[PDB]
Amino acid sequence: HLACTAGIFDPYVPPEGDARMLTQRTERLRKNAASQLAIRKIREFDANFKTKDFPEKAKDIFIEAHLCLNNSDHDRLHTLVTEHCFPDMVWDLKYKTVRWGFVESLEPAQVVHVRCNMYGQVTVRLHTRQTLAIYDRFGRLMYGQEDVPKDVLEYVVFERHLMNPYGSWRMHAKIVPAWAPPKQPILKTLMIPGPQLKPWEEYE
């Protein structure tokens, strides 16, 4: 049984300078031709789905999901996110302790584009400052700063199974814009191994 589908039905293309930017909201109205028919499909099963008010509900799930990581609330996190999202979030955090906090959001969240036997997928735009610090099994710090805020802009996709009566909005994936800055480097150092050769072979 699958309650989510990997990938995005229609990939929204973020425009450079959107962070600087009413305005963008009108662009959705201009682009409602592509998305409003999709919005109707979510509305048909729900009828309370509005692009203006959806981000608040989605934002709570996104923030809550990250909070579960601090407490390792795997059971809670499963409900918050779809099955596709969960493996990425927690697999690499095994035997690690992370302190995550949410600073005030820089800009209000707004729905960006939606494209759904029926899995409604809604793209949301979020810019928020957060704090991250990950430590080793021994407690040694390996990544992030305990009390320094980092401003991150990302687009988050939630997915709900419209057909199922029990279907609910769960985070499915995050769309990363190319203009987004690179992630912070790790504290530890890595080594790129040299070419491996047999005794007969010689270095080149």
Binding site: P185, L187, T189, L190, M191, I192, P193, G194, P195, Y203
Partner: protein, 292 residues
């Protein structure tokens, strides 16, 4: 008192270190590819201005750390402990290289600097001793030479055989203490202040500043002792295994001050010598060495 000079000299060395550290914010990753003959092509991502060649040797194996005395960064000789600066190609130099002439000079310079440290602390604080310079002589000469100027009160004093043995004991204690060689590149203006009292050191600092376009000069510190260096020095004092103060020769035209050139020989742990061979080398190292 000489102790007062060391205290202030040490502070300026410490403050300069802090300024350079503060100058670099955060850890910047630099891709350094290994161009050394052995294990070529390995690329390490290291922290800029923090990571040193010794860290890379630790990454590979303990053999590299023990056998690596110097590093060739982009074809340039770098100290094993000098923090890296940028992405580059690194190769490790050992005492058994086919052409150790570059390696020999660094050992030659370090031994001369170590000898200078012994002279200043060998005498009692009552006496006044000023170091003039470390003459550069070829290894073929058979001894490394350090020039020092004594006070008029010592014009009639010459070291005896027991006194020479005492100097080796002080030098041997330094080797046993195993003090790593600190390295700082400092501008002439700050260096002149650090060595303002010793007029002879002032001119030597000026010469190095004159050669390079900037005023940056190479300063090396062994614990409290600090001195200028013509080039790269040994990472630690423990490298030397045999050490001897062969003889001291007083320069004839030494009216304003008594300029003495001290002769010594040293051998690294990697290259030990037979007792008979060492005795002959010491005998051959007791002859005045001129600069040609």
């Amino acid at each position: 008192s000489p102790t007062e000079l060391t205290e202030m000299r040490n502070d300026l060395f410490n403050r300069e270190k802090s300024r350079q550290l503060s100058l670099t914010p955060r850890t910047e990753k630099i891709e350094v590819k290994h161009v050394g003959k052995t294990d070529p092509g390995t690329v390490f991502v290291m922290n800029k201005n923090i990571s040193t060649p010794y860290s890379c040797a630790m990454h590979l194996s303990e053999w590299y750390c023990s056998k690596s005395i110097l590093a060739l960064v982009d074809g340039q000789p770098w100290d094993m402990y000098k923090p890296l600066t940028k992405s580059c190609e690194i190769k490790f130099l050992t005492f058994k290289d086919p052409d150790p002439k570059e390696v020999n000079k660094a050992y030659w310079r370090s031994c001369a600097m170590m000898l200078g440290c012994v002279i200043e602390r060998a005498f009692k604080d009552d006496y006044v001793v000023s170091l003039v310079r470390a003459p550069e002589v070829p290894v073929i000469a058979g001894a490394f030479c350090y020039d020092v100027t004594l006070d008029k009160r010592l014009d009639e004093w010459m070291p005896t055989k027991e006194n020479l043995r005492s100097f080796t004991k002080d030098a041997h204690a330094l080797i046993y203490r195993d003090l790593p060689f600190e390295t700082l590149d400092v501008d002439a203006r700050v260096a002149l202040e650090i060595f303002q009292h010793n007029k002879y050191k002032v001119d030597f600092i000026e010469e190095k500043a004159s050669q390079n376009p900037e005023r940056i000069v190479k300063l090396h510190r062994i614990g409290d002792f600090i001195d200028v260096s013509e080039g790269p020095l040994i990472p630690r004092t423990s490298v030397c295994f045999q050490y001897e103060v062969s003889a001291v020769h007083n320069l004839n035209p030494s009216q304003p001050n008594l300029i003495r050139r001290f002769q010594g020989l040293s051998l690294p742990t990697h290259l030990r010598a037979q007792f008979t061979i060492w005795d002959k080398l010491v005998e051959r190292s007791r002859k005045m060495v001129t600069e040609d």
